[PDB]
Amino acid sequence: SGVTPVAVMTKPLPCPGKCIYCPTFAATPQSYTPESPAVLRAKSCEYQAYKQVALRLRIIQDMGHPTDKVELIIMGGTFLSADITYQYGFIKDCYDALNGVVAGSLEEAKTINETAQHRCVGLCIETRPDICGKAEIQRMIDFGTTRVELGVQMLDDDIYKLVERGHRVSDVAEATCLLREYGLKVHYHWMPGLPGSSPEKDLALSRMVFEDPRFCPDGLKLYPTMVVEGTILEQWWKEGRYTPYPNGTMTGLIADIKALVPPYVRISRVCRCIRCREYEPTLRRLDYPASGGKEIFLSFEDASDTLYGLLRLRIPCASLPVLGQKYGAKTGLVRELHVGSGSGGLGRKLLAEAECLARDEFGLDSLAILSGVGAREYYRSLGYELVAGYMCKHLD
Numbered sequence: 020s021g022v023t024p025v026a027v028m029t030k031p032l033p034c035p036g037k038c039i040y041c042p043t044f045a046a047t048p049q050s051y052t053p054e055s056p057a058v059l060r061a062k063s064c065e066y067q068a069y070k071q072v073a074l075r076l077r078i079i080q081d082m083g084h085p086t087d088k089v090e091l092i093i094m095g096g097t098f099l100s101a102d103i104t105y106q107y108g109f110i111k112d113c114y115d116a117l118n119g120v121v122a123g124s125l126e127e128a129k130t131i132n133e134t135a136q137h138r139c140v141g142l143c144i145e146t147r148p149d150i151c152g153k154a155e156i157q158r159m160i161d162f163g164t165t166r167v168e169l170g171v172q173m174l175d176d177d178i179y180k181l182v183e184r185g186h187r188v189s190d191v192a193e194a195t196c197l198l199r200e201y202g203l204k205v206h207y208h209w210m211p212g213l214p215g216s217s218p219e220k221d222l223a224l225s226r227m228v229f230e231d232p233r234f235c236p237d238g239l240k241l242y243p244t245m246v247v248e249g250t251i252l253e254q255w256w257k258e259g260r261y262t263p264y265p266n267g268t269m270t271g272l273i274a275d276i277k278a279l280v281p282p283y284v285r286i287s288r289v290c291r292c293i294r295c296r297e298y299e300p301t302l303r304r305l306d307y308p309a310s311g312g313k314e315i316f317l318s319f320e321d322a323s324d325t326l327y328g329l330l331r332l333r334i335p336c337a338s339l340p341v342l343g344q345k346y347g348a349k350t351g352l353v354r355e356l357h358v359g360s361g362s363g364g365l366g367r368k369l370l371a372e373a374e375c376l377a378r379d380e381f382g383l384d385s386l387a388i389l390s391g392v393g394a395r396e397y398y399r400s401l402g403y404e405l406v407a408g409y410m411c412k413h414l415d
């Protein structure tokens with residue numbers, strides 16, 4: 020059985036930036052997907068974490084789908100900007116709902132979940148590029164975050180974002196670098212058809228985001244921009260300040276964007292990407308520079324180029340995480356290890372390869388893996404041990 024997503028929304032928060040013109044509540048990506056099951060559910064649950072997760076679990080169980088492996092997805096983009104107590108409480112609430120038991124603290128809920136029935140093998144947080152510094156990242160590690168979706172939308176400072184205030188490309192670069200240096204998965208939100216853009220511009224930037232070492236995310240979450248009633252884009256469309264791409268245009272652009280994605284990239288819509296090769300396989304290696312460090316994409320693929328497993332190995336520019344003296348000053352980061360139905364030992368093979376590369380080719384002391392709490396046991400059975408949120412192992 021595969022991993023089941025559990026997507027929940029945080030409460031409507033005020034705008035992170037002080038501005039008398041800014042809207043009452045911060046703009047979310049879900050403002051333009053108002054008929055999504057999860058956002059309607061969230062509104063009906065008054066945005067309470069526990070209730071949302073419980074409801075979603077019942078729904079999944081009623082569909083006949085598995086719940087042993089779960090990925091938590093925290094939606095909004097402004098969550099990390101809220102009050103700290105609210106953040107820790109919200110996360111704790113989620114784990115409590117997964118566990119079926121209420122714990123004393125967040126750490127107890129996490130430790131309980133390590134062996135619970137509904138394992139949290141991943142935790143994804145949506146955040147804005149400018150709300151993503153060392154402090155926020157450390158909090159995310161406290162939460163047990165495995166993946167971060169950055170609200171990049173489009174990579175040009177002269178293009179209007181869908182959120183208030185917007186952000187700069189530099190912010191995206193910095194946030195991406197920091198996310199990588201802490202061993203997290205990085206996905207970009209990608210909105211083609213934004214005001215002040217063009218299909219050509221969107222295509223060029225799409226090509227650029229996979230060539231520039233400052234960027235190159237692990238995944239793109241494509242949000243095809245479209246005039247949604249009740250939003251500000253509706254007003255701009257009224258005023259003629261904005262005209263959306265025709266269906267054929269947008270579709271063509273999406274196709275062209277899918278046509279240029281590197282092997283190590285996943286594409287999802289709200290094609291030779293990861294998602295599209297899901298399915299004797301052999302081991303493949305693909306190196307590429309990123310954020311001053313090196314990224315190594317290992318995979319298991321057959322002559323049909325169908326994907327069976329992957330591992331993302333980072334050789335970091337610096338050792339930002341603190342793990343004590345036992346694991347040296349130079350450590351590699353396994354930012355992802357994913358394996359399809361069956362296999363399982365393909366994971367063992369990938370990990371062995373990773374350890375060998377880190378020990379021999381790059382002369383690293385240890386390997387650290389930012390695992391989800393429901394996946395920690397897996398790595399414990401491979402010789403890793405929990406240190407400061409990471410699953411670490413000395414290379415010998």
Ligand code: FES
Nearest residue numbers: 038040041183184
């Ligand atoms: S309305 Fe506040 S920054 Fe634009």
Ligand SMILES: [Zn+2]
Nearest residue numbers: 286290292295
């Ligand atoms: Zn795809």
